[PDB]
């Protein structure tokens, strides 16, 4: 029913990894990590690789600590407009 996460998410040792099949997909969805209030985390030290179309989000600065691991909140949507309610929100858990 609801949209499925457009990329591939992988919990790594020290970071969250989001992979896409092309740069077109990654720039189309433009994933960002947000806090409990839904604002993008500007102290997040993520890395972007457009050779392999991968986004890496370190747990410490980009995710929220909970019992057993981290919760990551991801927002995707169109970057060509200021219409924000068509964006999609996703929440994942990565065990420590």
């Amino acid at each position, epitope marked *: *029913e609801n949209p499925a996460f457009p990329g591939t998410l992988i919990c790594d040792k020290d970071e969250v990894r989001i992979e896409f099949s092309s740069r077109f997909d990654m720039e189309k969805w433009n994933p960002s990590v947000v806090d409990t*209030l*839904g*604002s*993008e985390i500007l102290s997040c030290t993520y890395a972007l690789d457009l050779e392999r179309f991968v986004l890496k989000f370190p747990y410490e600065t980009c995710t929220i600590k909970v019992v057993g691991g981290y919760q990551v909140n991801i927002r995707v949507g169109d*970057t060509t*407009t*200021d*219409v*924000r*309610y*068509k*964006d999609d*929100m996703y929440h994942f858990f990565c065990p420590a």
Partner: antibody
Amino acid sequence: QVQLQQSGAELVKPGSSVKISCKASGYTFTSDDMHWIKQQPGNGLEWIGWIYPGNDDTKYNQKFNGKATLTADKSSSTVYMQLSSLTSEDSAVYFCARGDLNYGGSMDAWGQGTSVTVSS
Amino acid sequence: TGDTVMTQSPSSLAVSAGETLTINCKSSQNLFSSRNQKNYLAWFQQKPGQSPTLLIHWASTRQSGVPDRFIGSGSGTDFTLTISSVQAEDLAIYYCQQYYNSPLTFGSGTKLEI
């Protein structure tokens, strides 16, 4: 110049269905969203869902899943909302509103409202 | 679950003529977009027997033809609508709305009676 003309009020028994039409004029029909809003008598406003007549993309409030169905006819520049299995909670005034995608989808233009009354 | 809750206060207001009232609306989620550096919040006025009317959008910007006595203000979580020198035609119910997220949500509303 922008006008939204909804169909007239309707009175039905519980369990029946109604289809509310909203005809848009004064702007490019497929370039904006159409929002539907429910106002119960003596109560506030509740957001049902939006439809984009361009590609017929839709988004619903999960509370209204299965209750409301949005469709759009580009030739007539008219958006339809179908309400089914009507109960007493479904008696309300229903507004269509244009989400202006230039300004973030904010709803500047509203229809006059359609009163749906469910009684047995 | 996941819905952005709009908490509007007070529920009702009773005032006279010429004084200035303030309506507060707080959101459970930030409505600020770093892209356009704006907060997604609208203020609506609905008189009895009429469709709602958009007063403020972007939480600070008045619609064309709206008197300057309506002042939208506030920050990502906290928003305020101030109506200076209230007039008889300002008698209505006022709603705050967030359009940053789907589902779009309203405040419970503020009844004004003079």
